Design a protein around this ligand. Sequence first.
Ligand SMILES: Nc1ncnc2c1ncn2[C@@H]1O[C@H](COP(=O)(O)OP(=O)(O)O)[C@@H](O)[C@H]1O
Lengths: 347, 86
Amino acid sequence: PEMVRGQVFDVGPRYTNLSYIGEGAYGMVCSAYDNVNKVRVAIKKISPFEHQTYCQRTLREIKILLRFRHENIIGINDIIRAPTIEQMKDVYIVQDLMETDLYKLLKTQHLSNDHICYFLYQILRGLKYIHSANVLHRDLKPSNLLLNTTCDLKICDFGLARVADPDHDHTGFLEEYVATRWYRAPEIMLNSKGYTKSIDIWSVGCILAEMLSNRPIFPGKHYLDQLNHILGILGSPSQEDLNCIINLKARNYLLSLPHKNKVPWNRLFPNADSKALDLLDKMLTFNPHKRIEVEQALAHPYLEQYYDPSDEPIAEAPFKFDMELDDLPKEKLKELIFEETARFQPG
Amino acid sequence: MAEYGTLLQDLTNNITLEDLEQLKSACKEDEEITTGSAWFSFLESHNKLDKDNLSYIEHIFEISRRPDLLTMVVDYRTRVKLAPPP
Ligand SMILES: Nc1ncnc2c1ncn2[C@@H]1O[C@H](COP(=O)(O)OP(=O)(O)O)[C@@H](O)[C@H]1O
């Protein structure tokens, strides 16, 4: 069994010459030579199916990624797993090998306005599709946006994605796998339900601000600190801003905090494009109902030169089918994983 | 030692029977029959709560979206090569 860095990486006779890329959210990531397509691919190993929420994380990542066909979303090219369900202790996902991600990129380059614009467009172009499928990503961040030097962007990792349902009660599955909350919408952070598509717009807003200045906008270290960071820039919430908060014990907490003034965007991003900030201001609106929606963002004057509604495709297989209702026996999820992955076996 | 008890009470005075339900749901994978201060002494006797072990309640107060609770824990822990686009 071909193995990388002391770990078993059984990627069959098809995928050979493995190279350790890095440690990911599911486990080890490798590059491999695909002997059928004559190219190097990326392979993610996803292992122990002994924890329920991890099986959840895996099914979402598979099911969603496997029924999406979009230029700006990474696709699954192959899945390797044991022929029998009892033997399936791990699952290998095979994707397009991408040169870098936006986290690594902002870590090295300072981006030109032109580059930012195109990247933002692609994020939103890919998002319009995600949303039209009735899907919430919930984990939009630089490290989840894969590039290669041609400037092609692909949104990745749908393990935390849920079907858009404001009536869904929050379970902490979100914070079980993502502790950093720099890109978390304020209402996610203090409500417990009512999360809408606009949580994803907020994240993109955070990603935009981070492309303009390379520093993250709200880099809070802890829970209460993250809230403080948001009000530190956005200013203390307005009369009706507060009305977005269903959790009265949270609403009172925000009110108990000392007054903070709004920091004008041009004072925070001295030499950023004026069209870029007007868009940002709408993406980083505390009030999730006032906050700009994806389709409207693409139509913003800042993306003037890329906006083409005929080349911005919507989902054909939307998650109306499946409210999805996971959070059930783990042995059943493993079966659903075995099922979803079955269309890649010798048959 | 005894000041941890002072702000165990502070937390118990701020957990209504209904908040208690939202708090035990947040302790998902980790028996139903508990009521208020019985929750703390359950956590304590399962090594999830000490004078020095606050990790878990700090976490549960976040998942339950209770900054008012967590703020009391914090406060009495501080005392104690790119190609051009088209
Ligand atoms: N398609 C890909 N091609 C090349 N490298 C990738 C690809 N996808 C992910 N990686 C790399 O694998 C590692 C982790 O994978 P992943 O878990 O999806 O990132 P994250 O931890 O932010 O969810 C990172 O170093 C990431 O850049």
